[PDB]
DNA sequence: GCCG
DNA sequence: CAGTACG
DNA sequence: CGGCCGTTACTG
């Protein structure tokens, strides 16, 4: 609907992106969604302030493609920007370590592959460059979700397992495949990752570990990478969270996202005196003068998501309706 | 970058 | 801790 | 002025 003037907002969100200006980013990646989640073609500055997420600053740069059909502002963007985005596309590196990359005379990934010092993670992101940016039709995800499915419930059929993220909100493709497992009597779901990895580690099914701190009983999650057997399969990226049942609720909402739905659901909460998290709905929370939680308030009951939704005086919304 |  | 990551 | 999600979860 606007995509004439987003496409180039888009460019400058990006570019502040990568080189850490992250309010800056966050305040242009608001403005670039509502001028998409709109209908009609903004036309006129005066539209263009009265849409939440724009402002007069927005506004005059709206305007300026409208009447100019560009913005000089694309024409002072750093060169050193589109290396800055090579390198942070590289799982385990971001803003920080392109930048020092950068100010090391790096530009390439090759100059990343033969001069860099990775970490453990940062050599699995480049082995994956590619695998990592691609999406994977949702059939794959399915594929996916049972093969971990079926290794949790062979040694326990009780496990509850659900891929969320954009799966679960209906998408045509996915990124991460994302799986919730809990376990409906409240205790079972307890270290149950070492026996899960090791047993997809088994069968040649998890390819690579990213995040995974098996020393400690009380492990999260799980951040890998898998492939499925046979030709023609591509490394895809593996999340896996275990959650306690009393915790089911607010972890499949966060799971399920969006990223940027949950961000607006939790901040909702703030405003009420409440706060929102994977691990529950809280009220009566104190806050200092920054907005920071220090005191816990009382865990409210959510036994479901549309109780999360109904204790936020909020219309309960289908996953599809929170792909924002 | 926007907003209260 | 800072950095990066998850939705 | 100053928050912008989570007293979010690992890594080293
Ligand atoms: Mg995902
Ligand atoms: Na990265
Ligand atoms: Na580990
Ligand atoms: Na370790």
């Known amino acids: 609907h606007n995509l004439h003037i987003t496409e180039k907002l888009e460019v400058l969100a990006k570019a502040y992106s990568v080189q850490g200006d992250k309010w800056r980013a966050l305040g242009y990646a608001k403005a670039i969604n509502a001028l998409k989640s709109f209908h ?16 007069k600053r927005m506004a005059e740069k709206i305007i300026e493609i409208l009447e100019s059909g560009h913005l000089r502002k694309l024409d002072h963007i750093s060169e050193s920007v589109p290396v800055l985005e090579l390198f942070s596309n590289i ?49 794959e995800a399915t594929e996916i979700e049972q093969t ?13 397992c659900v891929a969320c993220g954009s799966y679960r909100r209906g998408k045509a493709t996915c990124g991460d495949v994302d799986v919730l497992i809990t376990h409906p009597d409240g205790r079972s779901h307890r270290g149950i990752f070492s ?29 890998g990478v898998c492939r499925l057997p046979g030709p023609g399969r591509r490394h895809r990226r593996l999340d896996i969270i275990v959650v306690p049942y009393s915790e089911f609720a607010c972890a ?21 005196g409440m706060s929102l998290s994977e691990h529950a709905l809280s009220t009566a929370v104190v806050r200092n003068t920054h907005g920071c939680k220090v005191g816990p308030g009382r865990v409210l009951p959510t036994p479901t998501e549309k109780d999360v939704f109904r204790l936020l005086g909020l219309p309960y919304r289908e996953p599809a309706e929170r792909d924002w």
Not at 109 to 129: F, M, P
Not at 195 to 223: A, H, I, P
């Open 91 to 139: 799982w385990g590196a971001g803003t920080k370590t392109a930048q020092m990359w950068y100010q090391q005379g790096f530009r390439s990934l090759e100059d990343i592959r033969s001069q860099a010092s990775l970490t453990t993670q940062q050599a699995i992101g480049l082995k994956h460059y590619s695998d990592f940016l691609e999406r994977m039709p949702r059939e």
């Open 252 to 272: 499949l909402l966060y799971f399920t996202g969006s990223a940027h739905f949950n961000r607006s659901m939790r901040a909702l909460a703030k405003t009420k």
């Open 40 to 55: 009609k073609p903004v036309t006129s500055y005066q539209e263009a302030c009265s849409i939440p997420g724009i402002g």
């Open 148 to 160: 971990v499915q079926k290794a949790a419930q062979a040694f326990n059929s009780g496990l509850l």
């Open 195 to 223: 026996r899960l990895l090791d047993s997809l580690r088994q069968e040649g099914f998890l390819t690579d570990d990213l995040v995974s701190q098996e020393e400690n009983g009380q492990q999260q999650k799980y951040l």
